[PDB]
Symmetry: C11
Subunit: 89 residues, 11 copies
């Protein structure tokens, strides 16, 4: 095998892998949406607690965001800092 062929299938597999990793984004979208719903329900019934409601929503949502970020990082490594091309040959 020549080097152009080797890079070609390793990068092609990286494109597939990166796209697949992003499927994780489903999670934070569902979970954070739920938290948003509860915040909406709570500010209506407790206008006074708006400060706590929104800061608590944002903290909890930030935690729920993390695996979305992990997948994004894995995809950006595969696209822009690919660790396989350097191991070839």
């Amino acid at each position: 095998m020549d080097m152009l062929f080797a890079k070609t299938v390793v990068l092609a597999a990286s494109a597939v892998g990166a796209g697949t990793a992003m499927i994780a984004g489903i999670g934070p979208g569902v979970g954070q949406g739920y938290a948003a719903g509860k915040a909406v329900e709570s500010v209506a019934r407790q206008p006074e607690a708006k400060g706590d409601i929104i800061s608590t929503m944002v903290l909890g949502q930030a935690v729920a965001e993390s695996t979305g970020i992990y997948s994004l990082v894995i995809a950006l490594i595969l696209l822009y800092a690919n660790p396989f091309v350097g191991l070839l040959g």
Copy 2:
């Protein structure tokens, strides 16, 4: 392998990868719909809090939108700013 062949499989893999990434869009759809439902339930029962209900719904939904945007960005990079073609040869 010649350069046309190399670009061909790297770009083909990119098309698949980009479409696969967009599957993440399921998430924000579900979550934001839920938040919308709670907003509807809350403005009915408390017309007096319409301002807070809608601003809270939009803030929380915007957070839930983020992984949908990440996947969109990954797909648009693969289609219009593909980082693999330049690494070839």
Copy 3:
């Protein structure tokens, strides 16, 4: 590889990619249905709040529609404004 072969696998991959992106449509379907259910429950309870109920339902649903639209746009780019065929050769 000749140019006809190159276009053939890039476009074939684009057909698969476009179909795959549309899977995101599951999300808005679920979420918006939920918002619709809450709107139904609310207009039964408070017929006078019908204006706010329906305008709030539509606003929240529109937000939940966005990732469905993103996938539609990605699929239409792949079918009718394909960015790969021009990069070939």
Copy 4:
């Protein structure tokens, strides 16, 4: 590659893509069913609001139907107005 071979894999890919896009139909099925359940619960407890209940159910369901329609349109384009065969050669 000859033209018959090129059309063959582009169309075969289109058949797979079209079937895959239809997976989105899961969404509206779930969401609209939920809305239906809420309408059933509401007309039982408020026979008087039947008109508003059913018109609100239909409006909200119609919105939830849209990504099902998008996938149907993408599938019908791939089967009956295929945009790839004309780009070949």
Copy 5:
């Protein structure tokens, strides 16, 4: 490529595409079951509203059935009125 080979892979891809489209049937199954459950709960508590309960259940369920039908139609087109075989050659 000869015509028998071309028809063979286009039809094989159509078989896969048709089966894949039918995955959408999950949706109406879930949603309509939910509507059924609410109808059961409502006739028990409101025997007097049985007429409205059942007519409303059927209307709402019919709407939720549609994407199941779309997928069935796409599958039957691929099996019995295949649009690709005629484009070959």
Copy 6:
């Protein structure tokens, strides 16, 4: 290509397609289970309404069964009345 080869890949694709279509069976299982749960909860509270509860459960479940039947029909067509083998040659 000879005729035995053509039948072989068309039928193999049909086996995969048929199995894939049956995935829809998830739907009715979930939805009808829910309706069953509501029927159980309702006969316990209101033993008198047992007739209406069970007839309403069966009607609603039957509707939810339909996409499971559609998939079964598509799979049985592919196995026992395959429409592709006759189109070959």
Copy 7:
């Protein structure tokens, strides 16, 4: 193609198809579990209605079992009464 090769790929495809069909088993598992939960909750509050609770649970669960059985039947046909081997040559 010789007959041994033809049987080999048709049966291999059948093995994959049969395993894939069994994925439907997810559905009845979820739905029937739910019905079981409601039966547990109901016999605790209303020990008297135990007879109706359990007979209603079993009836509704049996209905929810059906698509599980359909997939099982499709898989057993593919394994023990395979309809493709006889169509070959």
Copy 8:
């Protein structure tokens, strides 16, 4: 094709098929967990009905277990009583 090659792909497909069938195990896991949760909630509130609660939980869970068992049986047939190897020739 020689007999060793034929057995090789039929068995390889069987390994994939068996693994795929086990995906059904998701279902009973979800459903039975739900039933367990309801049993916990019920014995806390009704220590007196512990006998009925646990016997009802086990009966209902057993029913929900069945499609998990079906998939297990299909996988064990493919691994230890494979019906395809004997049909080869």
Copy 9:
């Protein structure tokens, strides 16, 4: 085909099959977490029923664990007691 080639694809397929079977682990994770949540809610309200709450949680969870174990067993058979290698030639 030589024996090394035959073992290679049968074992490779076994690796894929074993990984696929483990997907079932999703189920017990969801269901048992639910039971855990109900146990938490119940010991808070009813500290005196702690004994029954925890023993009931563990029994019900153990049942929900079973399909997780089945998949583990299938995966360990494929890795450490593979039944296909011995059937080859």
Copy 10:
């Protein structure tokens, strides 16, 4: 086939298999998050039961963690103690 080729496809299949097994991680994430939500709701309402709430949350979550661990173990066996390479030849 030479030994390098045999190890190559067996290990490549192992990488795919290991990645696939990790999909089970979805389950514990969902379930344990639910248990966490109930613990939060319970300590707010019953600060005095904090000890029991947290110990019960951890016990129940640990049980829900198990299939996540099983998949991790299968993946680490495939990566670091691969049982297939030794069976080759």
Copy 11:
């Protein structure tokens, strides 16, 4: 097979495997979002228990984070400490 070819398919398989493992991220996103929702609802109703609410939310979420981390670790091993390349030859 030469060493460049062996490394190429083992690494390509590793890219796919790593992306697939990240699909687990869905789980913690859903579950932690739910816990966040409950924390929002609880601080609104009970501002004085803010300390316990947030510390309990973070503890429970951390537990739910673990399988997200496991998948991340498996993906980073495959990308930056790949255990297969060293086993080759």
